[PDB]
């Protein structure tokens, strides 16, 4: 009835071994290394501006806020890395064969939530660009209304607080995931 | 009261046998073969670009991003295959006659979820085209606003990360489904 | 207090007998006959095109996709038949007088779900026409944007995969309903 | 503290008697009579057209589909009658004084659901007119797009299947309500 | 720590006595009197028109339906009275000091629901005016489309069935509330 | 590890004492005083108009309804006072240290609901102004449609019934809150 | 299998110590200091205006309300500080290793809710600017409608009550969080 070609099965077994090796190295070495790198990034001066008047840009309908754009470019690669690394670790947890079954399900759900939240971060950076564009377009059509000029300054300041929250939250995820997977794996294995 | 013509019943029984044979071959041979093919596809250079500056396209309102379009064309057939193959396997699980009843219901629900998620992937590729079109149309109407030019570059980069996530997720589904159906079928049969 | 004219009651009893006879014949003979007809329809070449480049239509804002329209015309009568036949069977289950009561309620709920899903299929065919029309209208207003031309090709391809899914799903419903009603009726009757 | 004028109380008691008499006659005689009338209406040729090409109307932006309008005019009075008759029966169930209390609550909830569904039927007939109007208006603004012409034909065909479903469903409600109220009243009274 | 001026407390006690007296008279006398008045109103010829062709108004974009407007003016005061009277009774139930506590909570919830539903009735009369206005405005912009003329006739007929349902439902509330409060108060008091 | 500067702690303790004193006086004296003031306000002639024809304003697109605006100005300060006073009382309940714990949580939830409802009242007054403005703007663009003139009269009448409901509801909150906090505090303290 | 480089582990341990020290100082000293500062801010005259006629600004489409803008500028830094400080404390609670486990989860959930509410406050300040702008734009297009002029005055008054509610609510959070974390930490540690 159901049987597998030995040659195909052997090649599949190598895939299982490769995923396991990548996951063990990622949790043991990559996750800790990133926590140190992100903590230093928060300390850097660009993400620690005391007064938000400086981030504001000057217009007469054209230039985007250059200071904010540069911060976004540094943030985007880090969000992408968490999404790619998390997917590999999640598959390793699912592949592992085990009370123990319940613990494994909790770990997969927790990893799944981190992946979904990361996508939200990428989406919010995209939403800021479209929203700022609509308001900047509005200023040209109705020059006299002061509030339209005021809203564009507010959207720039809100993004700065938000981007710092994303970097801190990604650093939080690495330490929390590292500790949780290490404690849970011993129970899941047995 | 209720009785069936023998000739009609015999022809129906052949349909039941045909569906069962296709399902056993699909789980035992097709699902494993695809996992190997998709894993190689991820390794290929086009899906592994290190810097997302290269994927960006240059405009003066016309050409779509050629590099992204080519990647989408390769991804679409694979999503279609999972939808067609999953439907045949789901019917086999429903047809099987069996604690055992509960296990069978779990398998049908799990297969149903994979089918619905696959449709979502096809929908997101469609949404990207309509959204990019609206933003490209906006650039022509309001040339001066820089943010509108910035949003179209962002939508191209977001799609690249998303398409790679779809290929990895489809590879994840094949290994997870193969293992789950094989373990569950022994219990369902008895 | 409450009593019924004998002449009116006799005519009502004939209605009850007529509905019962139609239902028994429909489950025993019509449902099996349709499963065979639909399975052959899937095998036919029009619903099995290997490459979706062929289904694409050529425009300079006018002609709809002729190949897709012809497939839709064949699909619509089959969806209509399931809705009409299911309503008659559902009334027979409700009329039957019976643990047994719970089984009867499950059957009515299952029949009700199949009826609602069938209406969804008719609605999706309608939505495709309105959506394709809006996008085709957009191409004329903004000729230069390539993405608008690309979206109309994508909507045609998505519909082809969807229509085949509807025919396969209707075939799935007939076999599942036939088996479920036959097993459940013995328990419901007793 | 709390007491009622005898003259006012006597007049109220006559209202209670009148509602009870109308309800007993409606369930015993009106509900059965309607089931016979609606069953004959379904048999009539206008509601049984084999091919939906005939219902389609011919345009060059003006005339509504005459065949569909005539069917709607016959359907509207029947939906109105169920709403008015159901309200009187529901009040009788609430007035009755009684395990028995739970049975009474189930009957009121079931009667309430039938009343709400009937309102939905009246609403859908209204929605078809507004939707067809918008699409017919669109054809004039953009004559070349064929899909806009195709959608108006589809909306006419969908309505025909829907109107027949309403007549069959109203016939279903009468038989189901008649049987349920008669069985439940004996328990509710005691 | 916490104590109240005797003079202020005495004046508050008079408020409590006044609310109690108004509530007892309203449930014992006002609620029954209204049930008789509304029942006669339903019997009156204007609310009982057999054919809905008569309610239809004739236009060449100007006059509202005079017959419908007159019916609405009679209905609006009655809906307002239920809202004002119900609020006073609800406060009396809350003030009463008492198994008994649970019964009191059920009565307040039931009174609260009647108050909210009454507001819905006032809202629907308002919605009809805005909706009819938009459709009448549409007829002038696009004279040729017949369906726009058809929709305005349909909205008038739907309102007539709805207004009669409101008057019957308000009559239903008075009898149901009268009976429920009288039965519940004895338990709540003890 | 964790310790507090004595000087800072002493100043914080004075804040705790001040909040407690304000709350005890507010529940014992302010809440009762307001109930008497609001009850007299309802008795005043402006809020008791018998016929709603008088509130209607006469237009030829300009003046707002003066009678309604004056009533709104009196209502707004009272809604603001409940929001400010409720916040202080809620903090006192949270600060109190205690079966007893559950009673305290119920009181905070009840106080929180009253605060949220009060904000809704302020929002509805704002919505009326924007909605009336849109309809008044519509009358000028399309002078002939009578229904647009009719809707503006209806929105004025609906607001009058609504404003009286707000004043009565605020009076209801004061008596209910006074009684509930006094009964609950003895249990919470012990 | 899983092991960590000693040098990397030592650097991570220093991160854990640094976060713990910052959290203990923040709860013991920063949270109490802020409560005193905010309480004085509420006492200041600008946030205590008796009549809201003064906050209103005079227009002939141009100037924003200067008095309101100045109040917003003072409020924004305080909301930002709570978001940044709360994130550090939340990580300390998660890092702590412990009935005790349940208490820790409650504290993290409570801290998470305070962080989300703070973001809502920043969002509402942004919404006021966009909404006031749209209404101010409307006044210019349609000068005659008085209600549009009335709505802009109402939006200014609503914001003043809202900003004072934010400052009071932030002061409430500091005292509640300080007390809760101090009581919970002893149980969480043991």
Curated annotation (Swiss-Prot), chains A, B, C, D, E, F, G:
Compartments reported by the entry: Nucleus; Cytoplasm
Keywords: Acetylation, Apoptosis, Cell cycle, Cytoplasm, Host-virus interaction, Nucleus, Phosphoprotein, Proteasome
Gene Ontology biological-process entries: apoptotic process; negative regulation of extrinsic apoptotic signaling pathway; regulation of G1/S transition of mitotic cell cycle; regulation of proteasomal protein catabolic process
Molecular-function annotations in GO: endopeptidase activator activity; identical protein binding; MDM2/MDM4 family protein binding; p53 binding
Superkingdom classification of source: Eukaryota
Residues found modified as Phosphoserine: 14, 21
InterPro entries per the UniProt record, alphabetical: PA28_C, PA28_C_sf, PA28_N_sf, Proteasome_activ_PA28, Proteasome_activ_PA28_N, Proteasome_activ_sf
Residue numbers of N6-acetyllysine PTMs: 141
Induction of synthesis: Up-regulated in thyroid carcinoma cells.
Post-translational changes noted in the entry: Phosphorylated by MAP3K3. Acetylation at the major site Lys-141 is important for oligomerization and ability to degrade its target substrates. Deacetylated by SIRT1.
GO cellular component, one term: proteasome activator complex
Record family assignment: Belongs to the PA28 family.
Free-text function comment from the UniProt entry: Subunit of the 11S REG-gamma (also called PA28-gamma) proteasome regulator, a doughnut-shaped homoheptamer which associates with the proteasome. 11S REG-gamma activates the trypsin-like catalytic subunit of the proteasome but inhibits the chymotrypsin-like and postglutamyl-preferring (PGPH) subunits. Facilitates the MDM2-p53/TP53 interaction which promotes ubiquitination- and MDM2-dependent proteasomal degradation of p53/TP53, limiting its accumulation and resulting in inhibited apoptosis after DNA damage. May also be involved in cell cycle regulation.
Domain description: The C-terminal sequences affect heptamer stability and proteasome affinity.
Assembly and binders: Homoheptamer; the stability of the heptamer is essential for the specific activation of the trypsine-like subunit and inhibition of the chymotrypsin-like and postglutamyl-preferring (PGPH) subunits of the proteasome. Interacts with p53/TP53 and MDM2. Interacts with MAP3K3. Associates with the proteasome. Interacts with CCAR2. Interacts with PSME3IP1 (via C-terminus); the interaction is direct and promotes the association of PSME3 with the 20S proteasome. Interacts with COIL; the interaction is inhibited by PSME3IP1. (Microbial infection) Interacts with human cytomegalovirus UL27.
Record-given protein name: Proteasome activator complex subunit 3
Highest classification ranks of the organism: Eukaryota, Metazoa, Chordata, Craniata, Vertebrata
């Amino acid at each position: 009835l159901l049987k597998v070609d030995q040659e195909v099965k052997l090649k599949v077994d190598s895939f299982r071994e490769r995923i396991t090796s990548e996951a063990e190295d990622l949790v043991a070495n990559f996750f800790p290394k990133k926590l140190l790198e992100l903590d230093s990034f928060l300390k850097e001066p660009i993400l620690n501006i005391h007064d938000l008047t400086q981030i504001h840009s000057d217009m007469n309908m054209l230039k985007s806020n250059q200071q904010l754009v540069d911060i976004i470019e540094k943030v985007k690669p880090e969000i992408r890395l968490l999404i790619e690394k998390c997917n590999t670790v999640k598959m390793w947890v699912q592949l592992l064969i085990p009370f123990g079954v319940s613990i494994q399900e909790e770990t997969v759900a927790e990893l799944r939530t981190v992946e979904s939240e990361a996508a939200s971060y990428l989406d919010q950076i995209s939403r800021y660009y479209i929203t700022r564009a609509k308001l900047v377009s509005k200023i040209a059509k109705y020059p006299h209304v002061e509030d339209y000029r005021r809203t564009v300054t507010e959207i720039d300041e809100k993004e700065y607080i938000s981007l710092r929250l994303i970097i801190s939250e990604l650093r939080n995820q690495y330490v929390t995931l590292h500790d949780m997977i290490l404690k849970n794996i011993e129970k899941i294995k047995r």
